Ligand binder design. Structure first.
Ligand SMILES: C[S@](=O)c1ccc(-c2nc(-c3ccc(F)cc3)c(-c3ccncc3)[nH]2)cc1
Ligand SMILES: [Mg+2]
Ligand SMILES: [Mg+2]
Ligand SMILES: [Mg+2]
Length: 337
């Protein structure tokens, strides 16, 4: 059975949602799409409704629409955006051109944290803990975020944190994906967490590059130029030539860079901000670091069910992706409240 939909216009955007969703209010817009806060009369909960922008403009867009829905239908973890609902006003595949996603409303993100701020910076411990707990789950299913930044980490008034916009500026980007030295593994997201943790402790962007060249220069100033064992592993000759053409920079003492920060924080930052992705701490390892002694519980840091990413290698028409997306909308089952 299909519920009753109602139509309204907000910021030059048509919203057509089921009547259970009331008091739609814009909170966000951009390339990623448009988001309204609403009230869900069924649950009694405050929700965020996202309308995808131009979901089927190109094969690239249509495949991205499919990828987002598949990723969001998979995530069942306290520190990762979960789907309460997905719908289209469309009555059949033929007039399917709009997709709406629904999740629990989150008031803020890591750019604007005040309701969490305390003198001892014990809030940093809890926020990074929740990021690592979410990344452990995502990483266990072979999902890498790749673009983690403060604006992608949503925060409640309770200071509960969730990762969103995953599996899909340059300040938080790992050196190896900015260029493509050794390709990349899951630890590209641990680099980003390092940069975020650094920014929460100091109040400044760790590495605010103006371009890719300035960005790499700011990074090598802290971590130092690659050693013998790292140079050996760069398969790109363009990258390897550039690194070696620069003057040698030493690795700095982090204790002096992050002066007066918690020495357990400085030690974790040293394990996260290593050039060589093979020796960078993993999310599972970082959770067991003494910095998180108060929060860490090995029996409450769950892993994900296996995730079928075979679709990623497939080359289909806009209409094939659109039909595959329509099937995922129909087969959706909300979590048992
Ligand atoms: C990449 S840019 O920084 C960016 C920031 C936020 C979002 C963004 N996407 C969502 C969002 C909402 C509903 C969904 F079903 C899925 C995602 C939210 C959201 C969720 C809950 N409460 C408030 C806002 N924020 C997307 C892109
Ligand atoms: Mg890597
Ligand atoms: Mg900093
Ligand atoms: Mg891990």
């Amino acid at each position: 059975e299909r519920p009753t939909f109602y139509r309204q216009e907000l910021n030059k955007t048509i919203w057509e949602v089921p009547e259970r969703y009331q008091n739609l209010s814009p909170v966000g817009s951009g390339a990623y799409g448009s988001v309204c806060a609403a009230f869900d009369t069924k649950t009694g909960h405050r929700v965020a409704v996202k309308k995808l922008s131009r979901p089927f403009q190109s094969i690239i867009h249509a495949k991205r629409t499919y990828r987002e829905l598949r990723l969001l239908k998979h995530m069942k973890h306290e520190n990762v955006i979960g789907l309460l609902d997905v719908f289209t006003p469309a009555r059949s595949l033929e007039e399917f051109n709009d997709v709406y996603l629904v999740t629990h409303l989150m008031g803020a993100d890591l750019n604007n944290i005040v309701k969490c701020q305390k003198l001892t910076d014990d809030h940093v411990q809890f926020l990074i803990y929740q990021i690592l707990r979410g990344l452990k789950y995502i990483h266990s299913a072979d999902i890498i975020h790749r673009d983690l930044k403060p604006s992608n980490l949503a925060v409640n008034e309770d200071c509960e944190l969730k990762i969103l916009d995953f599996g899909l500026t340059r300040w938080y980007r790992a050196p190896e994906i900015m260029l493509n030295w050794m390709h990349y593994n899951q630890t590209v997201d641990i680099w980003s967490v390092g940069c975020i943790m650094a920014e929460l402790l100091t109040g400044r962007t760790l590495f605010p590059g103006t371009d890719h060249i300035d960005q790499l220069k700011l990074i090598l100033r802290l971590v130092g130029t690659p050693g013998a064992e790292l140079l050996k592993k760069i398969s790109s000759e363009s990258a390897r030539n550039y690194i070696q053409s620069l003057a040698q920079m030493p690795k700095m003492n982090f204790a002096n860079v992050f002066i007066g920060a918690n020495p357990l924080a400085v030690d974790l930052l040293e394990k996260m901000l290593v050039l060589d992705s093979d020796k960078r701490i993993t999310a599972a390892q970082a959770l067991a670091h003494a910095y998180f002694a108060q929060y860490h519980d090995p029996d409450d840091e769950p892993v994900a069910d296996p995730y079928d990413q075979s679709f990623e290698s497939r080359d289909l028409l806009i209409d094939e992706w659109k039909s595959l997306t329509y099937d995922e909308v129909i087969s959706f089952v909300p979590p048992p409240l």
